[PDB]
Structure formats: C-alpha cells, structure tokens
Amino acid sequence: SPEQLVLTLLEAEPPHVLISRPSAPFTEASMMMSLTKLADKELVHMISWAKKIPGFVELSLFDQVRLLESCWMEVLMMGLMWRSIDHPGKLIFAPDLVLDRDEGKCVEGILEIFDMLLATTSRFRELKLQHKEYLCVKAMILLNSSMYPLVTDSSRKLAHLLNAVTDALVWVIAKSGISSQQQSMRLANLLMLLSHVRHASNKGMEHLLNMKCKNVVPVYDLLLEMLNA
C-alpha cells in the first residue's frame, strides 16, 4: 500500500560508501581501481537493500538472483545520479570522490559513460525529481527486468510487487496537485528515462568486462562474481 511502501523504501536506503582519491595523480589503472573498489562495496549493500523491499525475499532464490544480476549496474548508476543531481558537471561517487566530467578522459571509453550519466542526471534535475519519486523508480529498476521463463508463482509475485511500486509512484506524483494530463506526462517522462539508465548500464558493463580482459584493473569478490556473469 502506497504510503507504507514508500516509507519502507525510504528506510531501506543503503548507506553512502566512503572512499577517497589516491594520494598520487590518477592513472587509468588507479581511477578504475577506485571506481570498482567503490562498486564492489556498494554491491554488498545493494543486496541488503533489495532484501528490505517487501516481497523480495518471498520470491524464489533464482528470481532474486536473476533480478540482481540483471539490474545492479543500473541501480549503482541511479544512486550515483541521485547523489549528483544538484551538482552539474560533477559525478558524486562518494563525499570524498567527486569527479569532474573532464576526469573521465583519464580512462579510455569512460568519458562517454560519464556524459550519458551527466545528461540523464540533468534531465532528472530539469524534471525536479523528488526524493520519493527516486525511491520508487530505483525499486522499479530492480523489479522491472525481462525475465523470460527460466527452467529451474514467483513470477506472479514479481508482477504484484512491481505493480505496487508503480502504484506508489503514481500516488507520489498525485501529491503535486498538477493537472491529470500533466501527471500522465510526468509519469511518462520519468519512465522514459529507464531506457537511458539501461543504456548507460549496458555501456558500463561492457567497459568493465573489457577492462577485465585487458587486466587494466584486477576485480575482486562480489563485483568479479557479478561480472563473471
């Protein structure tokens, strides 16, 4: 139910992971070390987050795993964009790791990703994305992956959940009071951005899978596992 669902998501928010710039100037290697080290630690906390979304832990293990494998980069990116929303030209990876757009030039292929992330963040800024809208959209990201049958009532449970989250977002938007037509337009504008997040996510994944090829960074643990696919 919408008020309670929204409160749960609010209370589910993962902690901000702290990381600092290296002492020495960035290199391609050390920049990727920082961002993947951050990502690995955020993944640990993403799991606890997911488990706090009502219904999530009632899905079958495979469904839980499959949604998280599918959406984790999108969710890292969406949390990054929310952190950065008020700081044009910057990506607020952590309180002490604030990258200017130009710093992506440090690593081959990453400027384009920064630019995609920055443009999507500016669109959310232009729409004046509210905290409670971001909570619902981020949860919609987790829950809205293609599934196709796997060969292993979870899937009906998934549909009900996503439904409730989408209802909660519609309910949040109705608080603004704007015209019925404008509430439809805002919903569309928000959801159409899900594509942009998926698209950036795809470019991010491929970057990381390739870096990992080149051994331009060693990757560890949860992050390595998620990537191994």
Partner: peptide
Amino acid sequence: RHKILHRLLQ
C-alpha cells in the same frame, strides 16, 4: 557461479 551472491541472499 553465484557462489557469493547466494551466500548473501540466504
């Protein structure tokens, strides 16, 4: 395969 993920979900 999801050796560590299974671990944190369960």
